[PDB]
């Protein structure tokens, strides 16, 4: 059990590093509804061939950096940018709460 | 060969050209501890007269209540007006734990053990009147087979 996780990337913008976004789905310990919770991980792409849109797997790996303790494992599918939007648009919804 | 228990005796008046005219109403529960119960509510211009009218009327709203080893067969919620009541039966060794009002209603049916709780408006006239209807909506293990079949 070195915690394999699967999630969509979010960035390809840093050297040998990407941003897997994985999703957890579970009930609510108080309400019977089954809700979503998501979390962002930073991963190790030494081949620099894991890029945006790539739906990959990650593993609880040895420490690589401060917030980088997981390795990329393998690929699931690459053609998934419509999810990156849902990250690209959400963080751009974050825009309109200011002066 | 019955048993009268008065829920409450209260006082109502009405303004009149020069004063107020009191009247009385009562809530007795006819009982027997055989399962046959009865509830009434009679209006009188004097106390020991409503008790008759209340005692009367109840000897008419007769209700056959089933008994399974000293309690209630199933679980029922019955709301009436803003007053609500929920009756979960109890294995013996429990005791009629209910409000001072419905206790009478259940006692005079032969119930020794039953779990209860008043809910919503705890006005007795609403709370009583509801309990009877709750007891009336009761069924037994036999009526289900007669309902869900018919040959």
């Amino acid at each position: 059990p070195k915690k394999v996780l699967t999630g969509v990337v979010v960035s390809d913008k840093m050297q040998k590093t990407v941003t897997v976004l994985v999703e957890r789905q579970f009930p609510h310990p108080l309400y019977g509804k089954v809700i979503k919770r998501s979390k962002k991980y930073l991963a190790h792409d030494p081949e620099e061939k894991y890029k945006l849109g790539d739906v990959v797997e990650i593993i609880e790996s040895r420490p690589i950096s401060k917030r980088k303790r997981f390795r990329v494992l393998r690929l699931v599918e690459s053609g998934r940018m419509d999810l990156v939007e849902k990250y690209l648009i959400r963080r751009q919804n974050y825009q309109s709460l200011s002066k | 060969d019955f048993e009268e228990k008065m829920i409450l005796i209260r006082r109502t008046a009405r303004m009149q050209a020069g004063g107020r005219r009191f009247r009385f109403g009562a809530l007795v529960v006819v009982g027997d501890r055989q399962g046959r119960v009865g509830l009434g509510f009679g209006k009188a211009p004097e106390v020991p007269l409503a008790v008759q009218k209340a005692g009367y009327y109840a000897r008419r709203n007769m209700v056959e209540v089933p008994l399974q080893n000293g309690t209630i067969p199933h679980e029922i919620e019955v709301e009436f007006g803003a007053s609500k009541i929920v009756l979960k039966p109890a294995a013996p060794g429990t005791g009629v734990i209910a409000g001072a009002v419905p206790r009478a209603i259940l006692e005079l049916a032969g119930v020794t053990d039953i779990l209860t709780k008043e809910l919503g408006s705890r006005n007795p006239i609403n709370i009583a009147y509801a309990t009877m209807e709750a007891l009336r909506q009761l069924r037994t293990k036999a009526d289900v087979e007669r309902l869900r079949k018919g040959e």
């Binding site: 609510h28 108080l30 309400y31 019977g32 509804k33 809700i35 | -």
Partner: protein, 122 residues
């Protein structure tokens, strides 16, 4: 509401507030009286209730009601504090325990004595 509105917003603890804010939360307290101006009760009454304003080690300056056949509490007199209100005293939140420090009890009494610092005679 909706089940969805709930997980997102949720409920709030009612969080009721205290009626004895003598601080610390201690049940009793020591303080020195400062005022004794017997004031008049609320609407449906008219007596000369015996009152006193106390300043506790909590640092708060608050009135307090006095009970029984008179007393001996003067301007400078260390006292106690207690709990309980008075329907007729809009501003009296506490009470005075007697038989402790300078708040002496009540002479001549036999019914109810724990409440007035009265011992058992003969």
């Amino acid at each position: 509401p909706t089940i969805n509105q709930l997980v997102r917003k949720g409920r709030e603890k009612v969080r009721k507030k205290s009626k004895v804010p003598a601080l610390k939360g201690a049940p009793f307290r020591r303080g020195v009286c400062t005022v004794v101006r017997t004031v008049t009760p609320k609407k449906p009454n008219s007596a000369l209730r015996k009152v006193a304003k106390v300043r506790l080690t909590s640092g708060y300056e608050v009135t307090a009601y006095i009970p029984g056949e008179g007393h001996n509490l003067q301007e400078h007199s260390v006292v106690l504090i207690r709990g309980g209100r008075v329907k007729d005293l809009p501003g009296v939140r506490y009470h005075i325990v007697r038989g402790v420090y300078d708040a002496a009890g009540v002479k001549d009494r036999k019914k109810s004595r724990s409440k007035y610092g009265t011992k058992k005679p003969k």
